[PDB]
């Protein structure tokens, strides 16, 4: 059940095309890392000296990148995605080194313990694995096997996951309402902390693994004694579900954001003096404090919008609190707009899209291009204005989960759409005008660089897709199976992968020419 | 010095429900103030005037509802559900001579929401449903108040069957849940004791012990729910003896002022509230007599 | 010809931070035939302990009832139960049946033990089941009250006073040595209050109903003396917990169930809190000093039958344990720690019956199905918990570390 997907995007896409899920920081190189709902992990530069913060993009995963962890002093980065994978990256040189495929559902969170270079992946498959970062980064193609280690316990899907610095407590948070705790060495269950009435998206542990801060969708933050296996305190600073938390170096002050949109610094010892730092534009998904100064100077914040703000906490000591501290950001990283709507047109070739700015635009699916921006124009009126009396059957599917256009071609309807070359827009001095197959005409423009589809030819003649367009061979509701760019097809290792991954049904009309 | 009805064949379904309905203080008022209402008013007038044979009712009912015509037994909930909104679309018709809430809807009517939630968005979408009966499924050694929480359990859309979130613009986990939003003036609780356990290609009776209090609040409530702590008082219950759907005998239990009253077929008997604990259900479950509750009528305090 | 045979279990252990508690069925007690009692709905199996000064070391004794029968044996805790076929005393009540009972802990020794026994008629008997010899039969004539007795207890520190309580929503004080009337004896008022009355016996001689205590609407389900003795906690079918100063005969404080009416009650071992099971499936936790609700506990699928603090797992940080058992056949254990007790420290009427949203809602540490029948007995002891269900099996759960001894 092997599909073929491809993406209609610019070669770089230097901005987040969708709302950011997770933030690391590397204080040696003053770089941010964003992890995007738009599949892409970008590296930034937090020098306000620089005008152009962008540095690189780190591109492999197919769905959302739900969480990231930076480790080995910024050398290595670990990513977890709705595409069910856990990926190991070289964060200096910005490229993916390994894919771990041991989860069975979205990998939803990642936890890190510096002092042993240990990470844990967890998610909707209710499972939690433990990974020694050092063995991951020595994965070759010859000593490529890793030995897997999990934790029994969770009875429902996991949404959050924290380890202490020492690598001696790990806490899962979950839709089970209840926090579960383990010792990562032995894997022994240590306790369950009953208390929250809802899912738990946020978890923090002090360095010693003796206290825990938990943020939940019940709208409360909780401070836990792991010694007295019970809840010490319960702070209700928000109206709505708390989905992110940071803490200061002494575990006295908790920064908290979520759906509410308001972000507060709260003093655990004195709740009634909370400073409302800001009301963000969107729901807060994650935060990361600037840890180069005690009184933490700054907090970076991610939301469902593609724009990533910093906020300074300059006046915290002298600043229900109705009045902000900051009313505008310190820095900004800018965000690209997201395609929120799609109409296939009657010809099953032109797509018409609306984005997060209400910028309508006209796209050729077959050739895999934009054609024209049409600005803040009405969309359903423009549907009409581009009506064409004709009927073509369905041959592809669209989805917008990345916020970029992602076209998918299943075996079943891919070819059920013949259109005659003249009204399709392809001339000839002959006036040949045969009934061409749009789906099949697409498959060979995608694998146009691949030698196995190359005597006295290269392509299907009538059109080329852009050479940067990424092609994705996936599985029905399944694992992403191989990924490349259109132009890269001719590479040595890549033709070997295309042999063992391209299904018979695409061999049929790209190699053999049967349909 | 008492009242009663008469058992022609298997009229106990009519008998029990009718008595139960007559002891609902706001129904009894509006049932006689002013078709099948014409015989219900003819019999509710005939009891306030004074063992009455409710003839006019039985063959009158056995004509214009052919499902009842049989002489075989009859599920007392089917009758209750029918009787009640047979009346309401007559009170709708007499309004259409001269989509508006009738006087049956002022009493037995309530609403409940079907909530759906992105566990990611945390955004939440409602689809309401009006009801007259609340039909609640039933387990061994339990309370209606537990069984009511089961009604409002959380179904979880996940894995290969995840939910497309409009806002999340993708496939996410979600929780679907039913909750009472508008509570009725009279909460009628049906206990689903008759369950088509299709091993045999048949129905079976569940003689499980389900306890019910005389005073009642609901925990199920919507959150946007309008009057969520309506205290209730047990007005009347329909017990039911026997061991199957079609060999049963229905009985009523009733409150008017202090006294509590049984109505077997004809035969009335004053019994103290202490005596309602016989009608909870069986533990050891000999599948035997299981004299046991079935339709519970709770009335608002306010 | 032939036919073909076409075609859920109880838990025997739980863990808690302390360790693994284990049901020990070799320490089980029941009728000697071991046949499960056919719970009729009629009236509850109950258990009562006493120590006879531990004259042998084997000084603990047990008494329970099963409809018409009533037994009395040597209770050997987590050791092999005493031979069930050879009681120390049996009793068969072909008339009205037992319902509750209580030993006097004070006048109690190898040669005599006073035990009084309530019945479903209203009677209260006074056996001494080691010598068999005596009896008494208070309210034999059914003239004081004809309703079934629900709770009977010797007064703390007394030898001769005791208290009984009936489905009528009344309680009566009795001296052992006095004697009941030939006719339904008269009273005149002593105290009057909002929802209770105490009358006192108008008689020119010493006649038993020393007094009659009237408490709210509906049956008085259970009462309980404060550990100190000074106060009395009363739960009634109208759902009020009414706590009284016993000596003063005045009303210390009240509490109302969210709904339903309250079925059991008990005191923390330091008499600082009361917990309360009822017909809303909940347990409630009440502060004596502050006269206020401090937590509810929702864990039970049916009505709550018995509640009891565990003296041996209670207490620099303050922590109580209590347990409940229900008509759902399940045992729940609970923890009261400082976050629920003292939220505000540094690091009809609804305002004596708080909103659900305003009071905390606790979760059980455990919640195990431990019998086929509805449960009726929860008792905490130095070496083990003791449970029992309507089908008359008296179960003994070894505490972690209390199963085996060495010296």
From Swiss-Prot, chain A:
Q: Tell me the compartments it is located in.
A: Nucleus; Cytoplasm; Lysosome; Late endosome
Coiled-coil intervals in this record?
none
Q: Outcome of residue 157 to Y?
A: Strongly reduces interaction with USP46 and abolishes stimulation of USP46 enzyme activity
| GO terms for MF | deubiquitinase activator activity; DNA binding; double-stranded DNA binding; single-stranded DNA binding; ubiquitin binding
Keywords (alphabetical) are: Acetylation, Cytoplasm, DNA damage, DNA repair, DNA-binding, Endosome, Host-virus interaction, Lysosome, Nucleus, Phosphoprotein, Repeat, Ubl conjugation pathway, WD repeat
Phenotype when changing residue 243 to A: Strongly reduces interaction with USP12 or USP46 and abolishes stimulation of their enzyme activity. Impaired binding to USP12
Start and end residues of the WD repeats are: 15-54, 60-99, 102-141, 153-192, 195-234, 237-276, 279-319, 334-373
Q: Name one GO cellular component term.
A: intracellular membrane-bounded organelle
Query: What tissues is it present in?
Result: Ubiquitous.
Task: Indicate yes or no for the key word Repeat.
Answer: yes
Which effect does the record note for changing residue 201 to E? Strongly reduces interaction with USP12 or USP46 and abolishes stimulation of their enzyme activity
Q: Explain what the record says happens when changing residue 106 to A.
A: Impaired binding to USP12
Highest taxon of the lineage: Eukaryota
Q: What is the effect of changing residue 259 to D?
A: Strongly reduces interaction with USP12 or USP46 and abolishes stimulation of their enzyme activity
A Gene Ontology biological process annotation? regulation of protein monoubiquitination
Main localisation, per the record? nucleus
> What mutagenesis or variant effect is reported for residue 261 to A?
In UAF1(11A); impaired DNA-binding. In UAF1(11A); does not affect ability to promote USP1-mediated deubiquitination of FANCD2 and stimulate RAD51-mediated homologous recombination, because of DNA-binding mediated by RAD51AP1
User: Which residues does this entry mark as bearing Phosphotyrosine?
Assistant: 15
Q: Does the keyword Membrane apply?
A: no
Q: What else is known?
A: Knockdown of WDR48 increases Akt activation.
Q: Which family does it belong to?
A: Belongs to the WD repeat WDR48 family.
Q: What is this protein called?
A: WD repeat-containing protein 48
Q: Which organism is it from?
A: Homo sapiens
Provide the taxonomic classification: Eukaryota, Metazoa, Chordata, Craniata, Vertebrata
From Swiss-Prot, chain B:
Q: What is the top EC class of this enzyme, as a single word?
A: hydrolase
Q: What reaction is this protein's catalytic activity?
A: Thiol-dependent hydrolysis of ester, thioester, amide, peptide and isopeptide bonds formed by the C-terminal Gly of ubiquitin (a 76-residue protein attached to proteins as an intracellular targeting signal)
Effect of substituting residue 219 to A: Impaired binding to WDR20. Impaired binding to DMWD. Does not promote relocation to the plasma membrane in presence of WDR20
The Enzyme Commission number assigned here is: 3.4.19.12
Reported effect, residue 12 to S: Abolishes catalytic activity. Reduced deubiquitination of Notch. Retains the ability to protect against HTT/huntingtin-induced polyglutamine expansion-dependent toxicity
Activation/inhibition comment:
Activated by interaction with WDR20, WDR48 and DMWD through different allosteric mechanisms.
Q: Where in the cell is it found?
A: Nucleus; Cytoplasm; Cell membrane
List, for all copies, the residue spans of the domain called USP. 3-301
The positions flagged as active site in the entry are 12, 249
UniProt xrefs under InterPro entries: Papain-like_cys_pep_sf, Peptidase_C19, Peptidase_C19_UCH, USP_CS, USP_dom
Where on this chain does Zn(2+) bind?
118, 121, 165, 168
Summarizing the annotation, the consequence of altering residue 172 to A is: Impaired binding to WDR48
Q: What induces it?
A: By LPS in stimulated macrophages.
Highest taxon, organism lineage: Eukaryota
Listed GO cellular component terms?
cytoplasm; cytosol; nucleoplasm; nucleus; plasma membrane
Keywords attached to this Swiss-Prot or TrEMBL record, sorted alphabetically, are:
Cell membrane, Cytoplasm, Hydrolase, Membrane, Metal-binding, Nucleus, Protease, Thiol protease, Ubl conjugation pathway, Zinc
Please, one GO biological process term?
A: protein deubiquitination
Which GO-annotated molecular functions does the record name?
A: cysteine-type deubiquitinase activity; cysteine-type endopeptidase activity; metal ion binding
Q: Name one Pfam family in it.
A: UCH
**What else is noted?**
Knockdown of USP12 increases Akt activation.
Would you identify the family this protein belongs to, as annotated? Belongs to the peptidase C19 family. USP12/USP46 subfamily.
Designated name of the protein: Ubiquitin carboxyl-terminal hydrolase 12
Q: Which gene encodes it?
A: USP12
UniProtKB/Swiss-Prot annotation, chain C:
Q: Which Pfam families match?
A: WD40 (PF00400)
Primary site of residence? cytoplasm
Location in the cell: Cytoplasm; Nucleus
- Annotated GO CC locations: cytoplasm; nucleoplasm; nucleus
Q: Which domain of life is it from?
A: Eukaryota
**Where N-acetylalanine occurs along the chain?**
2
Is this entry keyworded Nucleus?
yes
Q: Which UniProt keywords apply?
A: Acetylation, Cytoplasm, Nucleus, Phosphoprotein, Repeat, WD repeat
Repeat positions for WD: 91-135, 136-207, 208-249, 250-315, 363-398
Name one molecular function that GO assigns to this entry.
Answer: deubiquitinase activator activity
Its biological purpose is as follows: Regulator of deubiquitinating complexes. Activates deubiquitinating activity of complexes containing USP12. Anchors at the base of the ubiquitin-contacting loop of USP12 and remotely modulates the catalytic center of the enzyme. Regulates shuttling of the USP12 deubiquitinase complex between the plasma membrane, cytoplasm and nucleus.
Q: How does it assemble?
A: Interacts with USP12; promotes translocation of USP12/WDR20 to the plasma membrane. Component of the USP12/WDR20/WDR48 deubiquitinating complex. Interacts with USP46; contributes to the cytoplasmic localization of the USP46/WDR20 complex. Component of the USP12/DMWD/WDR48 deubiquitinating complex.
Name assigned to this protein: WD repeat-containing protein 20
Name of the gene encoding the protein in the UniProt record:
WDR20
